Ligand binder design. Structure first.
Ligand SMILES: NC(=O)c1ccc[n+]([C@@H]2O[C@H](COP(=O)([O-])OP(=O)(O)OC[C@H]3O[C@@H](n4cnc5c(N)ncnc54)[C@H](OP(=O)(O)O)[C@@H]3O)[C@@H](O)[C@H]2O)c1
Ligand SMILES: CC1=C(CC(=O)O)c2cc(F)ccc2/C1=C\c1ccc([S@](C)=O)cc1
Length: 303
């Protein structure tokens, strides 16, 4: 199914995450994005940062070419990287992501992060960045625009901007049973802003930003015990948890079996008691936990 965004467009509630670390051959993104679409994924999450937009757009275009899907059946997101926050850089950055993917438009374009970088940190009025995203939606380059990694105060800045034309349709943030974002989720729902969860499965645990001593979400005993009760898997429990909270959830897998497993999230449900047990896992744990973000003046978790 799909959720209706506050601008009238529609977002599929389960999305495929395309990020893989640079040790993975660029060509794997092409193969696993085709598998994801074959499996039933219709929402595809990419970013300038991921260095995979050529491969991901080819996968989408290839699945249009063989008649498996139409362009309008695919929801494709890209993101503005943080060295392009200056308003004059936003449109060219988007047109580059479009040229790489070879698409006429993205369904969704996000400010990837509030933590601006020199075009070394930068100081940018993100309200001006936002005005330039608005113009991109006006131009038809992005169907919808939104933000990623914004905390409540940074989102309020956008929402209270003098002469705002379009609300962010979404805030894409770290969100999973260890860090379930209940308060931010409530705030978003009160503004008809969709919360989209990334690292919903515990993150890739990349050693550059994630402490390998952090607990492994998918080994959690409550998730395991739920997975055994429903005869599903811990990953599926964690994904279904978000859908029943009204969260759009991403899932990265470069594995053929797992990509196909993840679509099973539509095939079952959890009870109130299951949901309450999962909500009781919350421990304020963001897996991305690095000096590279934490020392930034607009670090979202400075809270
Ligand atoms: N906006 C941002 O700042 C931001 C930040 C992080 C992520 N994201 C987006 O969100 C996407 C997903 O988040 P993430 O990359 O942190 O990964 P994730 O979705 O939390 O997945 C973590 C690991 O879960 C494994 N997995 C997938 N399905 C599984 C299953 N059924 N059972 C067991 N393990 C399974 C995957 O390993 P395998 O590949 O081996 O299956 C994956 O590497 C990202 O790729 C990117 O598209 C955005
Ligand atoms: C892999 C990665 C992600 C995850 C994703 O989007 O899937 C990410 C998300 C952000 F909001 C910001 C940075 C990153 C990132 C790599 C990265 C980290 C620090 C820097 S610099 C040293 O500040 C540059 C790049």
């Amino acid at each position: 199914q799909c959720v209706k965004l506050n601008d009238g467009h529609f977002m599929p509630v389960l999305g495929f995450g395309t990020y893989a670390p640079p040790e993975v051959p660029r060509s794997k993104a092409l193969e696993v994005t085709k598998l994801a679409i074959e499996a039933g994924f219709r929402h595809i999450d990419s970013a300038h940062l991921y260095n995979n937009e050529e491969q991901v757009g080819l996968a989408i275009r290839s699945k249009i070419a063989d008649g498996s899907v139409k362009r309008e059946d695919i929801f494709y997101t890209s993101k503005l990287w943080s060295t392009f926050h200056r308003p004059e850089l936003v449109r060219p950055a988007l047109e580059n992501s479009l040229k790489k993917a070879q698409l006429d438009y993205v369904d969704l374009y996000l400010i990837h992060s509030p933590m601006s970088l020199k075009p070394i940190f930068d100081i940018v009025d993100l309200c001006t960045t936002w005005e330039a995203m608005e113009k991109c939606k006006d131009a038809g380059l992005a169907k919808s625009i939104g933000v990623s990694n914004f905390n409540r105060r940074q989102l309020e800045m956008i929402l209270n901007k003098p002469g705002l034309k379009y609300k962010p349709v979404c805030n894409q943030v770290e969100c999973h049973p260890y860090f379930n974002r209940s308060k931010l989720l409530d705030f978003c729902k009160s503004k008809d802003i969709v919360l989209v969860a990334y690292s919903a499965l515990g993150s890739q645990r990349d050693k550059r930003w994630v402490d390998p001593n952090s607990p492994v979400l998918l080994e959690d005993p409550v998730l395991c015990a739920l997975a055994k009760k429903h005869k599903r898997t811990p990953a599926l429990i964690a994904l279904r948890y978000q859908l029943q909270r009204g969260v759009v959830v991403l899932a990265k897998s470069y594995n053929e079996q797992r990509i196909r497993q993840n679509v099973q999230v539509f095939e079952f449900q959890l009870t109130a008691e299951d949901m309450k047990a999962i909500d009781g896992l919350d421990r304020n744990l963001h897996y991305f936990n690095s000096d590279s973000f934490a020392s930034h003046p607009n670090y979202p978790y400075s809270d």
